[PDB]
Design a protein around this nucleic acid. Structure first.
Ligand SMILES: Nc1ncnc2c1ncn2[C@H]1C[C@H](O)[C@@H](COP(=O)(O)OP(=O)(O)OP(=O)(O)O)O1
Ligand SMILES: [Mg+2]
Ligand SMILES: [Mg+2]
Length: 425
DNA sequence: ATTGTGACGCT
DNA sequence: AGCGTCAC
């Protein structure tokens, strides 16, 4: 009743750049704009692996993780942009720098949590209070929400429907109550329209967004209407939305835990979780997961938007599949050196930009014929930004995996160097 | 022969 | 610390 808190205390947004690597390449090369086009890494094995897909190309069935030769079978006019290769490996610097452009603009409006290269959460609670008291009571015009969908409306042409739903929502709004969560979400959506407009004006990049009361709902909302649109998921919309929502669509339930929720409880949709007690869920999935599930099937989640605009780790990884697996000492050293040289470049730039130094080096490998993505992960001290030293140290830390009696056995199918444990500098 | 990331939990 | 999960 009155004492049942409803998870309506915050306004949270999730902003995701539409097919981001594709947009970066389309800005750089206007011949690629408004076309079926994809970004690919490498080119020799089956045309390269596709890692990003424009919405025009998705309409033909082109997806990430597809070989370019196969995507061309589905879409013969598919245009391709290749990731840069440096020191023998893909180098994602152009996309990291484009991401910083976008994150820096987002940070003008509110505090952000960089979730990935192309996604950030936004804590809009204080921004909305400021904008509300600036309003001083006047209603919110549909004109301020030109690309917003209100999930679940209308009830009782796509753009026509969008506007019908938005009118129904705005007519219902009690503007005089500055504490109404629905009003707070709406003002959040206004600010996110402004944020997205600034991003597109100042970078050329388009993005979609979700606006709700917590991170999981905002991310779910963001997926509902892409590309170049934003979706408001109100607390009231959760029962109908979750009633037919596959459990795997909720963030963190797309993997083995989600599968076990489905298998153990014999359900399919998020809303079905409401039938279980908190203790029942904890008994199946542990104290933390159980409490989290109990609240989240009711629309409630308390994970904070962390004030963190920069990555916590700086990593350099390469897979060596098939007959390209590394089999000699010289080979393992030369690739460790290539990785360490890219890492040194990125670390020196990071220290200059962001006033910090990494203090720990993580070295991870995969051996041929191991079924894990990671076979071993050991750390050592990272004391200076020297590629020769970092590569010698990573070797020193992995060398006792060689079981040869100049040769390397078993052959290595992945190398990975990660700088971690930053401290202010 | 999805790759190259990057965040977080468990013990 | 080292390993595992999750989401791209
Ligand atoms: N599995 C992956 N491997 C490599 N790069 C990836 C992978 N997933 C995503 N990326 C990169 C390329 C994408 O442009 C960028 C953002 O990923 P993501 O947001 O899932 O898709 P997207 O931005 O390409 O399209 P969407 O419009 O659906 O968001 O990160
Ligand atoms: Mg995206
Ligand atoms: Mg994303």
């Amino acid at each position: 009743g009155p004492h049942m808190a409803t998870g309506q205390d915050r306004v949270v947004a999730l902003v995701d750049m539409d097919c981001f690597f594709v947009q970066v390449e389309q800005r750089q090369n206007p011949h690629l704009r408004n076309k079926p086009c994809a970004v690919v890494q490498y080119k020799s094995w089956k045309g390269g692996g596709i890692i990003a897909v424009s919405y025009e190309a998705r309409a033909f069935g082109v997806t990430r993780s597809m070989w370019a030769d196969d995507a061309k079978k589905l879409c013969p006019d598919l245009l391709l942009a290749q990731v840069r290769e440096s020191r023998g490996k893909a180098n994602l610097t152009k996309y990291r720098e484009a991401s910083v452009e976008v994150m820096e603009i987002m940070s003008r409006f509110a505090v952000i949590e960089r979730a990935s290269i192309d996604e950030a959460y936004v804590d809009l609670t204080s921004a909305v209070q400021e904008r509300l008291q600036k309003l001083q009571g006047q209603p919110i015009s549909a004109d301020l929400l030109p690309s917003t969908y209100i999930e679940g409306l209308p009830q009782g042409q796509k753009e026509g429907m969008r506007k019908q739903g938005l009118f129904q929502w705005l007519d219902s709004l009690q503007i005089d109550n500055l504490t109404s969560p629905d009003l707070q979400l709406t003002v959040g959506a206004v600010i996110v329209e402004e944020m997205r407009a600034a991003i597109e004006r100042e970078t050329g990049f388009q993005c979609s967004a979700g606006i709700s009361h917590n991170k999981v709902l905002a991310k779910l909302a963001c997926g509902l209407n892409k590309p170049n649109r934003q979706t408001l998921v109100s607390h009231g919309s959760v029962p109908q939305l979750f009633s037919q929502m596959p459990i795997r669509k909720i963030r963190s339930l797309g993997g083995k835990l989600g599968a076990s929720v489905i298998e153990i409880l014999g359900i399919e949709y998020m809303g079905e979780l409401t039938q279980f007690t908190e203790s029942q869920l904890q008994s199946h999935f542990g104290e933390k997961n159980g409490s989290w599930l109990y609240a989240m099937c009711r629309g409630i989640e308390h994970d904070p938007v962390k004030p963190r605009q920069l990555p916590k780790t700086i990593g350099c990884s390469k897979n060596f599949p098939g007959k390209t697996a590394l089999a000699t000492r010289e080979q393992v050293q030369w690739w460790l050196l290539q990785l360490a040289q890219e890492l040194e470049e990125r670390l020196t730039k990071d220290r200059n930009d962001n006033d910090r130094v990494a203090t720990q080096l993580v070295v991870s490998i995969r051996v041929q014929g191991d079924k894990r993505l990671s076979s071993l992960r050991r750390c050592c001290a990272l004391t200076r930004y020297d590629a020769h030293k970092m590569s010698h140290d990573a070797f020193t830390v992995i060398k006792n995996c060689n079981t040869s009696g100049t040769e390397w056995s078993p052959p290595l199918t992945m190398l990975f160097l990660c700088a971690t444990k930053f401290s202010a500098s």
